[PDB]
Amino acid sequence: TMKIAYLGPSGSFTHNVALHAFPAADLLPFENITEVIKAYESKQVCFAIVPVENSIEGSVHETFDYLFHQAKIEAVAEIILPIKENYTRFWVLGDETPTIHLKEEDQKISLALTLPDNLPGALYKALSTFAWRGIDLTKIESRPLKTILGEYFFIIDFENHNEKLVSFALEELTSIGIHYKILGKYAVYR
Amino acid sequence: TMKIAYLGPSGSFTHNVALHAFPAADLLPFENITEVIKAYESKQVCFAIVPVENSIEGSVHETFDYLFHQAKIEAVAEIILENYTRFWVLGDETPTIHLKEEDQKISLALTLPDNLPGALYKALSTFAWRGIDLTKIESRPLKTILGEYFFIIDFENHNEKLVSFALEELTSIGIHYKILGKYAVYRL
Numbered sequence: 001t002m003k004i005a006y007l008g009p010s011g012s013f014t015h016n017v018a019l020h021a022f023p024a025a026d027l028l029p030f031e032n033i034t035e036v037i038k039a040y041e042s043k044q045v046c047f048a049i050v051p052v053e054n055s056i057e058g059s060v061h062e063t064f065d066y067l068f069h070q071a072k073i074e075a076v077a078e079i080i081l082p083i084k085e086n087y088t089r090f091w092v093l094g095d096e097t098p099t100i101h102l103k104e105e106d107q108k109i110s111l112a113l114t115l116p117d118n119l120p121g122a123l124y125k126a127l128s129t130f131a132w133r134g135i136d137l138t139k140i141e142s143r144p145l146k147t148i149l150g151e152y153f154f155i156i157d158f159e160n161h162n163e164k165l166v167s168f169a170l171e172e173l174t175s176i177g178i179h180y181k182i183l184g185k186y187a188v189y190r
Numbered sequence: 191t192m193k194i195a196y197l198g199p200s201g202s203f204t205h206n207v208a209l210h211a212f213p214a215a216d217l218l219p220f221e222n223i224t225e226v227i228k229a230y231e232s233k234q235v236c237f238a239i240v241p242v243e244n245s246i247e248g249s250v251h252e253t254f255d256y257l258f259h260q261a262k263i264e265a266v267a268e269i270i271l272e273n274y275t276r277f278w279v280l281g282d283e284t285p286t287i288h289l290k291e292e293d294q295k296i297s298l299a300l301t302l303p304d305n306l307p308g309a310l311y312k313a314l315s316t317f318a319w320r321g322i323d324l325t326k327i328e329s330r331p332l333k334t335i336l337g338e339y340f341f342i343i344d345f346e347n348h349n350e351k352l353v354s355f356a357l358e359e360l361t362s363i364g365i366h367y368k369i370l371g372k373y374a375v376y377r378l
Contacts, residue, residue: 055333119323141329149245
């Protein structure tokens, strides 16, 4: 919690976001999302703040590809910013849940799933696991696995209001042979 | 003397795709994907060739957004080789393509009830119980509010009457669809 990396330059939307999450902290700018996250990995900073999704353009490829393939870091808070495109989701990445007293709007968990034989055909099994328990899917996005055409990993968000039910959901995924990476468990602030 | 639009400039990857797919044709370049499709919409050309999926970036946002939000046209062929690996041929019927035919597929853009992604499992279950294999699932913002999307699914079109019942079932659930294409898949 001392030093915080954000997507530069100074006065950026991401800068504005990092100020609210960490008002007492030393905020250091980095030139691109990859370097922001690498800054944490190198232990220069304590948390990193990056844009992850926009209401018009969609998910930020750079953020999710790096977080899945390379990083061993989690989203620990989400802040939604109005833009005058309209709304963007920003994640606070780190190792602990920071204390943030902004208006809480939601609880979520984000997963990166890969399927057996990397077949998209078994996606329904993964979604049914959460569906039958009434855990609502709020987002799904596919990204290239960077192996061959037709192999992907999936970014899925679910409501995380009932964390113990979610835990069983994840256990069932495992029992089915579906592999997942937890990208984050976090509160959503607007 | 068929005129065909492709994503420019001359010597682009898409040119090269079109060059191999359509050796007898007059190939006209356009500056961006949106303009390529408009070339067809405006009847300047008989077909347009645009990238739909990239090995690194993934699905091409521009292509799918325009086709969903703005155009009322279908892909009539897919070629496996702004993007690098999957290309759609847009037009009104399937043209002669001088590549190896590999597959029959259909791509659908789905919207869900109250536009929340939560009912996606229903759309997928509809195809799953019939043994219709999905080969891709992508989403794009609906451009309404954050958390609202439309969903692109590609599936095998091996059994067309089974597909027809699936669509009926989608309908009965209140899931709506736009057919982005019914097409054969060709390999360069």
